[PDB]
Amino acid sequence: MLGQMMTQPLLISSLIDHAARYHGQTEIVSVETDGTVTRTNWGEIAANARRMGSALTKLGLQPQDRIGTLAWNNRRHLEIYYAASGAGFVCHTINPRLFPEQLVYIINHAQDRVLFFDATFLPLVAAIRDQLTEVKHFVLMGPRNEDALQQIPGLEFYDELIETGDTDFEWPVFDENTASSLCYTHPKGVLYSHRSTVLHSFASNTRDVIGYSAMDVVMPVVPMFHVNAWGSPYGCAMSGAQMVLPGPDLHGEALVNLIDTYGVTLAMGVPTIWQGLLAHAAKCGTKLESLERTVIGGAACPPSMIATFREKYGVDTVHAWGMSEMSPLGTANIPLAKHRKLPIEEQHKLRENQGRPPFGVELKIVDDDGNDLPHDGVTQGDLMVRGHWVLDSYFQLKDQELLQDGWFATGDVATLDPDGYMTIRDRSKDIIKSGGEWISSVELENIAVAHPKLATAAVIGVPHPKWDERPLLVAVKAEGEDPSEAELLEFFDGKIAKWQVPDKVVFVDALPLNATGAVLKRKLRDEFKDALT
Amino acid sequence: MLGQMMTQPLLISSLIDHAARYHGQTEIVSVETDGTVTRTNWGEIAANARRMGSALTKLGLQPQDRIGTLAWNNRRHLEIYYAASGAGFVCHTINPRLFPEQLVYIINHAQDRVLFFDATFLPLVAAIRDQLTEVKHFVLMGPRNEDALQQIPGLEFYDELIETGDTDFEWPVFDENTASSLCYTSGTTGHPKGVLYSHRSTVLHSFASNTRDVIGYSAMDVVMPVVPMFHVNAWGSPYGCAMSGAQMVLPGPDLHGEALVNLIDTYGVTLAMGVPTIWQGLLAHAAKCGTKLESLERTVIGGAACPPSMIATFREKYGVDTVHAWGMSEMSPLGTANIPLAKHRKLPIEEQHKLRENQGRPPFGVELKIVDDDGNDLPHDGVTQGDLMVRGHWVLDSYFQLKDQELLQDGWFATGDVATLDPDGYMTIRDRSKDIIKSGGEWISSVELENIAVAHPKLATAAVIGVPHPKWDERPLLVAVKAEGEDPSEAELLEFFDGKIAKWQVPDKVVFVDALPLNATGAVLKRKLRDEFKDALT
Ligand SMILES: Nc1ncnc2c1ncn2[C@@H]1O[C@H](COP(=O)(O)O)[C@@H](O)[C@H]1O
Structure with missing residues (x-):
């Protein structure tokens, strides 16, 4: 009715x-x-x-x-x-x-x-x-x-x-x-x-x-x-x-x-x-x-x-x-x-x-x-x-x-x-949920890209058997340079709490891109499934 | 779309x-x-x-x-x-x-x-x-x-x-x-x-x-x-x-x-x-x-x-x-x-x-x-x-x-x-059209009149209703409740209207009651007042 x-x-x-x-x-x-x-x-x-x-x-x-x-x-x-x-x-x-x-x-x-x-x-x-x-x-x-x-x-x-x-x-x-x-x-x-x-x-x-x-x-x-x-x-x-x-x-x-x-x-x-x-x-x-x-x-x-x-x-x-x-x-x-x-x-x-x-x-x-x-x-x-x-x-x-x-x-x-x-x-897509505290991936990218020997870089959450999720630095070497993993990781010291620094560095030719321009952090995560295991 | x-x-x-x-x-x-x-x-x-x-x-x-x-x-x-x-x-x-x-x-x-x-x-x-x-x-x-x-x-x-x-x-x-x-x-x-x-x-x-x-x-x-x-x-x-x-x-x-x-x-x-x-x-x-x-x-x-x-x-x-x-x-x-x-x-x-x-x-x-x-x-x-x-x-x-x-x-x-x-x-x-007063061929607001009267410090409340009159069909009557300690006279209440309303619209008479009849929602039962006072002017 x-x-x-x-x-x-x-x-x-x-x-x-x-x-x-x-x-x-x-x-x-x-x-x-x-x-x-x-x-x-x-x-x-x-x-x-x-x-x-x-x-x-x-x-x-x-x-x-x-x-x-x-x-x-x-x-x-x-x-x-x-x-x-x-x-x-x-x-x-x-x-x-x-x-x-x-x-x-x-x-x-x-x-x-x-x-x-x-x-x-x-x-x-x-x-x-x-x-x-x-x-x-x-x-x-x-x-x-x-x-x-x-x-x-x-x-x-x-x-x-x-x-x-x-x-x-x-x-x-x-x-x-x-x-x-x-x-x-x-x-x-x-x-x-x-x-x-x-x-x-x-x-x-x-x-x-x-x-x-x-x-x-x-x-x-x-x-x-x-x-x-x-x-x-x-x-x-x-x-x-x-x-x-x-x-x-x-x-x-x-x-x-x-x-x-x-x-x-x-x-x-x-x-x-x-x-x-x-x-x-x-x-x-x-x-x-x-x-x-x-x-x-x-x-x-x-x-x-x-x-x-x-x-x-x-x-x-x-x-x-x-x-x-x-x-x-x-x-x-x-x-x-x-x-x-x-x-x-x-x-x-x-x-x-x-x-x-x-x-x-x-x-x-x-x-x-x-x-x-x-x-x-x-x-x-x-x-x-x-x-x-x-x-x-x-x-x-x-x-x-x-x-x-x-x-x-x-x-x-x-x-x-x-x-x-x-x-x-925060923004859901930006969070790496590590054990003791969440990490902002863009904050780590902004540190990494400032390094004189990197064209660009991306940071992604990757699985870890003890900490659930840990950051991995996917870096593109700047033209004509061969920086080591050790020095790129050392560049974070004093710029962020040391427990937030990425666990490992991997080098690639270019980052997977979108016609939009920005990074497809999805295939990064897939391709580097076992980087820290 | x-x-x-x-x-x-x-x-x-x-x-x-x-x-x-x-x-x-x-x-x-x-x-x-x-x-x-x-x-x-x-x-x-x-x-x-x-x-x-x-x-x-x-x-x-x-x-x-x-x-x-x-x-x-x-x-x-x-x-x-x-x-x-x-x-x-x-x-x-x-x-x-x-x-x-x-x-x-x-x-x-x-x-x-x-x-x-x-x-x-x-x-x-x-x-x-x-x-x-x-x-x-x-x-x-x-x-x-x-x-x-x-x-x-x-x-x-x-x-x-x-x-x-x-x-x-x-x-x-x-x-x-x-x-x-x-x-x-x-x-x-x-x-x-x-x-x-x-x-x-x-x-x-x-x-x-x-x-x-x-x-x-x-x-x-x-x-x-x-x-x-x-x-x-x-x-x-x-x-x-x-x-x-x-x-x-x-x-x-x-x-x-x-x-x-x-x-x-x-x-x-x-x-x-x-x-x-x-x-x-x-x-x-x-x-x-x-x-x-x-x-x-x-x-x-x-x-x-x-x-x-x-x-x-x-x-x-x-x-x-x-x-x-x-x-x-x-x-x-x-x-x-x-x-x-x-x-x-x-x-x-x-x-x-x-x-x-x-x-x-x-x-x-x-x-x-x-x-x-x-x-x-x-x-x-x-x-x-x-x-x-x-x-x-x-x-x-x-x-x-x-x-x-x-x-x-x-x-x-x-x-x-x-x-x-x-x-x-x-x-x-x-007014409610069931309450509006028709006197000498022209409408009168009972709402206007009664709320003029309410303002007098010697009245606690008041209502105005129309009552029959042989010459004018209806005329306004003021039904007034005296304030707790007060004793207003009828004449001093009708004078309170002077210069607030046309002279022909002023109520012709005041009757006192100890309380107004109210309907089931707290408003005045003017129909009961009209029946009870149908003869106040005849
Ligand atoms: N502020 C007001 N002033 C004068 N009359 C009112 C006012 N509010 C409501 N009313 C009267 O109340 C009627 C509604 O009555 P009810 O449906 O019983 O609440 C309206 O049509 C008006 O006649």
């Missing part, structure tokens, strides 16, 4: 419709590539999103055709977010800082039919254009420009295209599991749905995760070009938050000036960009008066950075962790009631880890055989996740058997405590 | 499973009928709920059979919420303040197969038991009691039945649109009707309730729902608090003001929720004893219009923020919540306060509009009033055992409330 409630699909277009209906005049600020500042609002963004969705539809594209972007955080990237998905196409955010052959691989693999790009990337797109055989439309996110058209015949222009859209366009309806958007980690594509997008927004919009309010002025410096700017374009629409979109000017002085000029209350960024922001802030003496809180994810937030925001500015720092495969958010560091009964300096220390998971995601750690390990906060194992916005399989790789008993392995080794707080410790 | 994400149903059992995994030791305080207090936590509630779901499945119940309850807010009621819905049955909370004859109708219409009930209602259940012929199991929410077994032969006992449950029971997996729970709502006209929620609608409502500008239950909070778990599932809080791992104080049978003040001060409540009448006795007792209610941060006040003077007392005297909220049994309940917008910060302080007085604005997932008598759209200009319509992910489509009818108008549900809507989406209740 079914309930008797109204049932509507969870569609991304409903998010932008709500913001225009109940927060239409709420301000959005957009830093453009030409140095102007657009002052728009949820209502104009919605009408342009509808118009561009009609315009895209009139090009004859098929449902769920991919629409690529190479774009900063600005109003036109935000209109594309909702135009593409709302009209039934797939919004494919591309990282414009990748190498040219990486972009050619990604754009051709996703089969983008349209490529929107900001003017910063004109020369990059013009350079790779010849290799983009499946793109039917290149669209500069600005007005007609005679120089640009010279660089890319026959470029089209956003500000003309959008005028082809009907003013009365209606969003189509479809299954909420319809593919909505795409993001690549050879890089692998994660294909989101409307359902997963909206549930992730819901979760991220709860008070104890991030939680956007109508009273906030939110500045996402995390890029809309990768993992959905942590869901902020969607969460801010559900709540009618004001937004400051920083465009291409991300150096400390510009970001500080945004915060003080528009009164940013909530800022979202990664550690390296914040280091620049805090540097300019210390110099000019600003109090960052409106700032209340900051979300820092994508790389481990440094404890001293948290302390600076707290002690200098009275700003709470939310360390958050995630990945393209989790839409991205998996965990966020927000305290529990009992923590207030601890000494204050221990309360501070509790904020350093990657955080606790919200409803809709589940975490666990497993041993090398895949069996559960205790969540005691000290035992380490391979981190596994599942939930409403965790992927099931990678794009165009459905036949590939990714999940392990319904769980996605993240690649990290981690600890989990009884409350679910997660600490990233 | 579909996405390639994990696709799981949204389940009520996922809420308790998340609380148990990641908030297992977070404490829940439970005031019991036996006169003691239980200190428990989400982990225990969850393990008990698992065992009870197993025990109920072992009885042979079929999927979506109705499980009935007649119970206070306490740990066993919370365990039942998750035990029944998690196991795939319909959790049917029943209001024990209804007449015995109404309970017979409701329980037989819903065909409950199990009736859980608290000890307070043992005589009630025993008096009507022979008319509950489809209930197969009567379960005292307690341990074996011989006296009770005498009153109800074949009575069973919650603390024995739970021991029949398997320790390793796994919740069934099923479509998220499966029916989950059932609440009956009456008034006018005729027999009460059933609202049949789903797991999907419940989880979606929970997400929305947990955003910052609605309620937003936090792991730091100590939540006390005075609203009953049989009144639209205590406004969702048992689901929203599980999602967030909030601490809870569950008040049991004692809901008078002195009991509530003591709960807040003893267990450090930070967020409390109930209808206006519940807060009158709380504020009254608190003023007498001198407490500062130090731990209290916020309240959620809804179910009837919150008096503007109640908001200002919480703000001025305790530094407590009142969130005025509106909703319905048919809306799971939440419709609107009053939290500011960014542009309100720059207004003068007194106009900021005034904007907190209306019923609030809607979160994502629900939509509001007003229509005229012919059913066509009216402007959302904040002045034009009309019939309020709603729709969304947690709005009813049709009533239980009544899916035949064309209830909706153009896909919208008619609330029965008369309201204005402003361009920012703030809703203001004018």
Whole structure:
């Protein structure tokens, strides 16, 4: 027996419709590539999103055709977010800082039919254009420009295209599991749905995760070009938050000036960009008066950075962790009631880890055989996740058997405590599990390659009858040199604990490579099965 | 082309499973009928709920059979919420303040197969038991009691039945649109009707309730729902608090003001929720004893219009923020919540306060509009009033055992409330259309008049109703309860209206009573007051 409630699909277009209906005049600020500042609002963004969705539809594209972007955080990237998905196409955010052959691989693999790009990337797109055989439309996110058209015949222009859209366009309806958007980690594509997008927004919009309010002025410096700017374009629409979109000017002085000029209350960024922001802030003496809180994810937030925001500015720092495969958010560091009964300096220390998971995601750690390990906060194992916005399989790789008993392995080794707080410790593929302590193979490689007589080297875990696993140095002699095993091993002395030094050295002509370039440490392990027995 | 994400149903059992995994030791305080207090936590509630779901499945119940309850807010009621819905049955909370004859109708219409009930209602259940012929199991929410077994032969006992449950029971997996729970709502006209929620609608409502500008239950909070778990599932809080791992104080049978003040001060409540009448006795007792209610941060006040003077007392005297909220049994309940917008910060302080007085604005997932008598759209200009319509992910489509009818108008549900809507989406209740007063050819808000009167320091509370008059059809009558030490005159009460409302709308007469009649959910029984005073002006 079914309930008797109204049932509507969870569609991304409903998010932008709500913001225009109940927060239409709420301000959005957009830093453009030409140095102007657009002052728009949820209502104009919605009408342009509808118009561009009609315009895209009139090009004859098929449902769920991919629409690529190479774009900063600005109003036109935000209109594309909702135009593409709302009209039934797939919004494919591309990282414009990748190498040219990486972009050619990604754009051709996703089969983008349209490529929107900001003017910063004109020369990059013009350079790779010849290799983009499946793109039917290149669209500069600005007005007609005679120089640009010279660089890319026959470029089209956003500000003309959008005028082809009907003013009365209606969003189509479809299954909420319809593919909505795409993001690549050879890089692998994660294909989101409307359902997963909206549930992730819901979760991220709860008070104890991030939680956007109508009273906030939110500045996402995390890029809309990768993992959905942590869901902020969607969460801010559900709540009618004001937004400051920083465009291409991300150096400390510009970001500080945004915060003080528009009164940013909530800022979202990664550690390296914040280091620049805090540097300019210390110099000019600003109090960052409106700032209340900051979300820092994508790389481990440094404890001293948290302390600076707290002690200098009275700003709470939310360390958050995630990945393209989790839409991205998996965990966020927000305290529990009992923590207030601890000494204050221990309360501070509790904020350093990657955080606790919200409803809709589940975490666990497993041993090398895949069996559960205790969540005691000290035992380490391979981190596994599942939930409403965790992927099931990678794009165009459905036949590939990714999940392990319904769980996605993240690649990290981690600890989990009884409350679910997660600490990233290492990467599963990098660990050599020797008896008394685990060894990082990349740390030993970095020592080995610095030797004047080695072209390159690899370090692999190999079996040992007494220690389980021990490191073996697979070295390639540098041109014209004959170093001995003895001296190469002696080069580690004083650079690492002596019990971590590889047990033996083997020489080879070259290392087994991937078309990707990197080493296939798998055949190394097979070929040197009995090196230490 | 579909996405390639994990696709799981949204389940009520996922809420308790998340609380148990990641908030297992977070404490829940439970005031019991036996006169003691239980200190428990989400982990225990969850393990008990698992065992009870197993025990109920072992009885042979079929999927979506109705499980009935007649119970206070306490740990066993919370365990039942998750035990029944998690196991795939319909959790049917029943209001024990209804007449015995109404309970017979409701329980037989819903065909409950199990009736859980608290000890307070043992005589009630025993008096009507022979008319509950489809209930197969009567379960005292307690341990074996011989006296009770005498009153109800074949009575069973919650603390024995739970021991029949398997320790390793796994919740069934099923479509998220499966029916989950059932609440009956009456008034006018005729027999009460059933609202049949789903797991999907419940989880979606929970997400929305947990955003910052609605309620937003936090792991730091100590939540006390005075609203009953049989009144639209205590406004969702048992689901929203599980999602967030909030601490809870569950008040049991004692809901008078002195009991509530003591709960807040003893267990450090930070967020409390109930209808206006519940807060009158709380504020009254608190003023007498001198407490500062130090731990209290916020309240959620809804179910009837919150008096503007109640908001200002919480703000001025305790530094407590009142969130005025509106909703319905048919809306799971939440419709609107009053939290500011960014542009309100720059207004003068007194106009900021005034904007907190209306019923609030809607979160994502629900939509509001007003229509005229012919059913066509009216402007959302904040002045034009009309019939309020709603729709969304947690709005009813049709009533239980009544899916035949064309209830909706153009896909919208008619609330029965008369309201204005402003361009920012703030809703203001004018009246229930069954209560609105028509005098001399123009409508009068009884809600507006009575909450003007409530503000006078010499009245503890008041209500306004329409009564016949030979010239004007209806005229407003003020029914007033004098404050504890006070003796206001009739004339000084009607003068308090001067310049707050048009002169022709001021009540013509004041009658005093020692208490207002209240219905089974703490709101004023204005129909009884209209019958009792039908002649006050003739
Ligand atoms: N904040 C409020 N102000 C005025 N009336 C309210 C408010 N909240 C709920 N109501 C009334 O309560 C009705 C729902 O009643 P019930 O289903 O019994 O809880 C609504 O349709 C309104 O008439």
